[PDB]
Design a binder for this molecule. Structure first.
Ligand SMILES: Nc1ncnc2c1ncn2[C@@H]1O[C@H](COP(=O)(O)OP(=O)(O)OP(=O)(O)O)[C@@H](O)[C@H]1O
Ligand SMILES: Nc1ncnc2c1ncn2[C@@H]1O[C@H](COP(=O)(O)OP(=O)(O)OP(=O)(O)O)[C@@H](O)[C@H]1O
Ligand SMILES: O=c1ccn([C@H]2O[C@@H](COP(=O)(O)OP(=O)(O)OP(=O)(O)O)[C@@H](O)[C@H]2O)c(=O)[nH]1
Ligand SMILES: O=c1ccn([C@H]2O[C@@H](COP(=O)(O)OP(=O)(O)OP(=O)(O)O)[C@@H](O)[C@H]2O)c(=O)[nH]1
Ligand SMILES: O=c1ccn([C@H]2O[C@@H](COP(=O)(O)OP(=O)(O)OP(=O)(O)O)[C@@H](O)[C@H]2O)c(=O)[nH]1
Ligand SMILES: O=c1ccn([C@H]2O[C@@H](COP(=O)(O)OP(=O)(O)OP(=O)(O)O)[C@@H](O)[C@H]2O)c(=O)[nH]1
Ligand SMILES: [Mg+2]
Ligand SMILES: [Mg+2]
Ligand SMILES: [Mg+2]
Ligand SMILES: [Mg+2]
Lengths: 559, 372, 372, 559
């Protein structure tokens, strides 16, 4: 087992998550089996309790774990499945040793942060890195650890102490440290004192960096490389840079151009790892596929515009799996994507009195779009604006996908306007008044990977053809509210077909509307099962439908 | 336990619906037909009682001709096709009846030979036993010529690989039990990258433990890769078929869009010593069926021929290797052609008659016989 | 089927003839004694019916204490030796009764554990199963600590050697079946030149197939010779014990007139990573019993330690290697000492608890436990 | 009224009768009132004329109808009473329309197979399914129709044509089709072309299957399900399998595990049928009782052996109600049953010359048994062998039950050997010689449900205690011969007490012998009144007596 810590810097926004995911995928090009662990200094047990306004969305695993967003970067670059154990936190590990001290496994000893908590962290990392995470039976060859927060924040102290010990409690040449660090530019001169201070803060904790990975708005000067490589122990080829490029898929090839594998191939002795003839082929094949999708982003120009309608769209981190799911679906179509970020509340007619500027801009953006997405996220702000987007998309025949809350919004819209029930509404917020036209109801969560069964007549639907006309689908759920199953037959008779349901019925999971080119919704989040070469099927439907060629996509999928 | 007839009554109607009228009905069943099962079909269909044939689920497919002859099936076609009106010469009737006596003998030998030779067949998808039917029949012809019963041990080549010992430790130990058990080893061909290190491990085991080995098509290239990795000590030498995205210099295979059908192999001039050239009667040339796009790198051939892995035969042009035999092993051989396809019941495929004699012992007496 | 008593009546007379008078008669028989068999002995001898003990031919020798306790044998000696007159403290009675409950548990675990781990033991004269009794008992203690049943597969090391495939082909195939079958491998020690290439072949197989290996005394030197012959590629490197009439330069063993009894091993400074040093609780030193005249050539040690065969522990003086673990294998270990002799029923020998956990899986959970 | 046709396949031996009975009982677990109809393509009016060597025994209804054996499967799984009208045949319905055309109800029209015979079949099914068949007053909610023979046999043509019309002459969602079909396995691969051809033969007649029920020696592969569900209109959950398990009582729970109710609950809209609070309780209670008796067959091991002595025992279908009556009686005792099939003729001393092997085996089997049954069935073969079994059972004190001919055989045995009348015999076959020691006499049949009155002194008998010490019993008769009532007082004085008789006397119906643990006979067939939870009392006596605990059984029955 090899370990690669990706760590620290001078700021919390530095973009470690891209570099960790990219470093792991580059190791996967050698054919190595790879896994990864995110460490969070926060005291929350999970990202589930904490609101999307901080650290972006929670990400859902097959376990039903509501983990930190960074686990999604690993799953979509590395192709692996992660467990709720792969997101370590301060909350998890203090809860673990405190529950263990009350149970008494420490034999009446005094329990202390060193050695007992730092040995508990090292036991967690040793257990969790040996969980098999590919579909194959094998234990991973390499583990990427991403150390969240910044080095020398008091929040991090047990993890920087544990990782010092770990560099010896596992062999050297089985452990290596990448430090990620800020190189700000002032008056056009590339200033280095922030990264020199961060390299000292690592040495103060006994962590010694094997590569320094600069984050900068420029190519590093050869003087900027030398002034760091002379201050730190790293050689000139071990001062990595990652530029402020928009395409995060280019980062693996920007690291490969900087010869970063050729250092880790020595520094971790990756030639001593045994590999089969299948492994080297499936490794090199994966690199050629990534050269092709990045070539397609360099030379595809013909924009498809998708409008994304939701709360707090200024927090673009709040929708990162949607963004990445749309980008995978646009690459599969060989088309460039624009996302138009529509703050759903500004669509509402009250905005035309309160701030007439925001009203006209938000309705410009929505009218402009070749297809529409309503992305999910609980909370009562802007839902009539999201209902207005679903209405516009139904009436103007514009491709629509509704994910989680977006499906319920389309059901409420179709009830208010096509069934003509003018006060039909979500149970989430009006039930203090005990309303009879319930569109949502409660059914304390439904979470993680679940089976959807396609209902027997559904063979016609564009969405069931996108799932290869298979009878069942596996996707990740997260909801407490679902469509009222008393009203379902009214919608299924008026043409809004609930194409798929849970095994028990009375719990709707996919709809497609008869008489529209692509108007679809899902109760699950299709984003989380997206992979770079195999996009999320409902999103491959939406981004093909917006472009045209949805028939040719379905004809392809029938091979 | 009751022999149900409605499926065959429906199939006889489906023939009449197309205007095809059956002259014999040939039942396939797990039993002898009851005389009631014959009558209930012969009363429904136009066929007489002697025109309801049965063929039983016997293992020996060579017994079927004599099970049809016991059911008097020739004596119907001799009338129904008027085969007495066909003119035949005195040579024809002799070479006809002689052929029947030879078939009575080989079937008698399968009834009364008991002393098993075990051959391990190492390959992809061995659960699909139809995937290797000419290998199976070539081994059975070679075992009958030796007057010995055959077991084939079906080794899924991937399960030999050390990753299996982590993934499913049961399949690892069983596949290595089967390979260790065998009196001789065959690597059968078939393109595709699954299990090739497992096939390399079988070639290694057979070279080192001195156990008879035959490599057919991919099996020859696997033995060349094995001998390169382990006896020449080139640790990353490999097939061009799958690593060439990385442009590797130690090419064991190369491309040379197919080479197909019957072709001449010429034995290279020094090759008179080899058990394989003695099995081909010490004739200078051999005719066998090819099927490949990849062949041994002819730049590396002199290294193998100096280290003792002699490419005993090549194409007329050279630079295209077709038979090897290794100096210093009782029978370690490979072919680029498929020797299976030229096997016949009375005249088995020579490389396979070599393998199944070598496993049994008596390879010298086989070669002494062939010299007559 | 009748339980004959005249041999024991004659043995009871032979005791009286020397003036020795038996207080209990302990029968050894293939059955429960009949109550007539007890009475016919208790009437001939001075012993009462409860002083005619039996011990049955059960396989589990750990059941014998509870079979004697069921026959109330303590309740006789508690009178006949007046053991109530011996003074005992309150700690003594607790540590006494605690020990009985621990033995009830390990015997309960042998009654209800079913999930076999197979260890192959490779050596000279394995038909003499008494020749390896501390190995056998050390493996049984290590399997009980894992809550798993043990099979030992007794592989006569010489039969693995390729000369056996000519001399007696039956013994060749059976010995290689047994070795291929096993979840882990032990090379047990014992001087003498018979079968050592067969033991080298078992060490090779275990290294290459990634199968757990423990080499004890000669078994460590065999693994060093194997790693030298095949991974360093020194084809004639060998034991000084038997070739030194030819004065060979590639010495793997050398003489260093014995080293005997309990000695200290010091773990070398970098060794914290090793499964074997974790099994010894990450303590800096180990106390174990030595018996050898030959040891690893300390001139060649840095070559092995650079190629990944780490001599994890040495004598206080250095130049005398005592534990190795190989980088890049789940559990490939050897010891110069005999770890068997320090095994105890509740506290198994650490290298053997490593081997029998490694074969089963759960070696991490064993090491996590030992860290408490 | 709902209809469920169970139909067809590729072969006549396929086991529709178990699947029809099991499907009906599963519908009864919902609390629905259920009924069923067997259709036979044969030209016999009844199974009474036709010999037991074909289609097994005739089954007797309360009407005295000698119906097809399959009606017994329905009565014993569903708990219902069937009338002679519930077995439809070609003979019945052509006799009906031909007698109706000669009477002239068709008003001088030309009468044709379509529409007149197919409308007569549809009128029969509509009349007969509305006959009340539970003990309660209600008309059935659901009817199971079992279509006998195979589809596209010319024998079946009027019934496959009638059932096409019936799918419309009754509403869809009030009719559904189960097709039962053969999935043979060759070289371990599950071949599907026979069932694809049978699904085409249904479509050729316009019958469209709602479920395909495979009969196979294996679990279906998921590929075997998909390759059928892709060829036919049925969804993956509508490809049912029934495995070659020995316990036919497990089939209801194997269908329930395959979620077959959850399809029919939609496809027949069984939630629209009104049900009372008693109905749902007595429905769910019935399911728990069936879970218990099947659990008892999984975990009862302590075998009771019963020897069954009769003609043609190689035809095990000839004794199916005996077999099922013994299995109900062994389950009530919580004991596993072996039946030992003794061909009665092989017991006879002539066999020891003719084939000495068959002699020794048949006497081994009879000597081995914990109890003995002589099962009935007319015909002169083997009767001295059956007399020898009755002798052995009387003399060795081994439990004996004689049913119909088996009672007369025990009377002949007791006369030949205990009264010592060496030539006393059946009137059935010697009366060409006009013998005075008549044991049987003729008394043209006595058929159907009749009253037995217990004779006044009979309170002591194990058999009258098994009938709860009630004064009268209701059971199904079928005989032309009975005990000579002139000789009855000789037997009643020598200890062979005729415990019960017909209301008129001179017609004996139950005997029990004084001075044996359980030696009993019946003139009626007790098999036909057996039910899964309430076994036939004479058989519950026999199988308790063989096991021991006959006193505790009688003590229980006194509650
Ligand atoms: N080299 C980079 N190139 C482009 N964008 C980057 C880069 N580094 C960081 N970012 C961007 O900055 C944001 C944060 O990056 P990332 O998630 O990798 O940082 P992080 O250290 O893991 O932050 P956090 O601790 O909150 O998870 C993301 O929008 C990411 O795409
Ligand atoms: N699924 C099954 N499991 C076990 N036994 C079965 C099954 N299907 C059929 N059989 C057995 O095969 C025989 C015939 O079955 P069944 O009576 O149900 O078939 P059928 O189609 O009604 O035949 P028939 O038309 O003659 O009445 C019986 O012995 C029955 O127990
Ligand atoms: O204003 C002043 C006065 C004095 N100094 C003095 O401090 C010294 C250290 O030099 P700097 O502090 O400029 O550091 P640096 O250029 O090495 O590092 P970067 O942060 O640019 O990467 C010398 O340059 C000396 O003149 C200043 O740096 N600034
Ligand atoms: O369940 C029933 C009811 C009725 N029938 C009726 O159909 C008839 C045709 O008889 P079969 O259908 O049994 O056909 P078969 O025996 O001739 O053919 P195999 O498939 O066994 O070769 C008669 O036997 C009649 O009773 C059944 O076959 N099965
Ligand atoms: O063949 C003979 C003849 C005579 N005897 C005679 O010797 C006597 C002593 O009897 P046993 O010699 O049989 O001795 P035992 O049964 O007491 O002892 P076990 O060895 O069975 O424990 C008597 O039995 C008497 O008949 C034999 O024992 N065997
Ligand atoms: O011997 C031959 C030659 C040709 N074919 C050809 O017929 C085709 C149809 O395929 P099959 O006839 O094998 O049918 P199937 O596998 O779909 O159905 P099952 O009966 O196994 O359920 C193709 O497989 C084609 O090669 C055969 O099937 N058999
Ligand atoms: Mg912040
Ligand atoms: Mg991050
Ligand atoms: Mg029949
Ligand atoms: Mg039936």
């Amino acid at each position: 087992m090899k370990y690669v810590v990706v760590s620290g810097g001078v700021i919390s926004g530095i973009g470690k998550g891209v570099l960790a995911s990219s470093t792991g995928m580059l190791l996967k090009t050698l054919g190595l089996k790879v896994t990864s662990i995110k460490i969070d200094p926060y005291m929350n047990i999970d990202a589930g309790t904490m609101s999307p306004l901080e650290h972006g969305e929670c990400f859902v695993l097959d376990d039903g774990g509501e983990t930190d967003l960074d686990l999604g970067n690993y799953e979509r670059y590395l192709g692996i499945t992660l467990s709720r154990d792969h997101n370590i936190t301060t909350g998890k590990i203090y809860s673990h040793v405190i529950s263990r001290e009350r149970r008494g496994d420490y034999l009446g000893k005094t329990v202390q942060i060193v050695p007992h908590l730092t040995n508990a962290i090292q036991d967690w990392i040793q257990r969790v890195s040996k969980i098999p995470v590919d579909d194959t039976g094998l234990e991973p060859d390499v583990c990427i650890i991403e150390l969240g927060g910044t080095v020398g924040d008091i929040e991090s102290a047990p993890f920087v102490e544990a990782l010092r010990q770990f560099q010896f409690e596992v062999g050297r040449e089985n452990f290596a440290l990448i430090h990620v660090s800020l190189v700000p530019v002032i008056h056009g001169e590339q200033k280095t004192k922030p990264t020199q201070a961060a390299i000292k803060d690592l040495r103060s904790l006994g962590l010694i960096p094997d590569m320094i990975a600069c984050r900068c708005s420029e190519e590093l000067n050869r003087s900027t490389i030398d002034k760091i490589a002379m201050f730190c122990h790293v050689g000139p080829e071990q001062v990595v840079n990652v530029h402020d490029v928009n395409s995060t898929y280019h980062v693996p090839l920007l690291l490969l151009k900087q010869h970063m594998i050729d250092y880790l191939h020595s520094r971790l002795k990756l030639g001593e790892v045994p590999l089969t003839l299948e492994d080297k082929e499936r490794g090199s094949q994966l690199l050629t596929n990534w050269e092709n999708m990045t070539k397609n982003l360099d030379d595809s120009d013909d924009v498809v515009k998708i409008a994304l309608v939701g709360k707090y769209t200024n927090l673009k981190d709040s929708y990162l799996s949607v963004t990445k799911s749309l980008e995978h679906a646009s690459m599969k179509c060989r088309r460039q994507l624009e996302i138009l970020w529509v703050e759903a509340s500004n669509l509402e007619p009250e905005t035309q009195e309160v701030d007439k500027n925001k009203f006209h801009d938000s309705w410009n953006k929505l009218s402009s779009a070749d297809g529409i997405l309503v992305p999910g996220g609980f909370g009562t702000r802007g839902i009539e604006g999201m209902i207005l987007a679903a209405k516009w998309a139904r009436e103007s025949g514009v491709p629509f996908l509704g994910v989680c809350l977006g499906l319920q919004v389309a059901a409420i819209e179709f009830a208010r306007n096509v069934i003509g029930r003018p006060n039909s509404s979500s149970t989430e917020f009006l039930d203090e008044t005990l309303l009879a036209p319930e569109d949502q109801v409660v059914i304390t969560m439904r979470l993680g990977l679940r089976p959807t069964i396609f209902q027997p007549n559904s063979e016609w639907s564009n969405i069931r053809k996108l799932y290869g006309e298979v009878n069942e689908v596996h996707e990740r759920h997260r909801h407490r509210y679902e469509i009222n199953p008393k009203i379902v037959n009214d919608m299924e008779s008026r043409g809004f077909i609930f194409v798929g349901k849970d095994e028990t019925g009375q719990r709707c999971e996919i709809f497609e509307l008869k008489g529209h080119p692509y108007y679809v919704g899902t109760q699950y989040h299709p984003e989380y099962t997206s992979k770079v070469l195999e996009p999320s099927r409902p999103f491959w439907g939406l981004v093909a439908a917006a472009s045209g060629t949805l028939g040719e996509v379905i004809k392809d999928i029938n091979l």
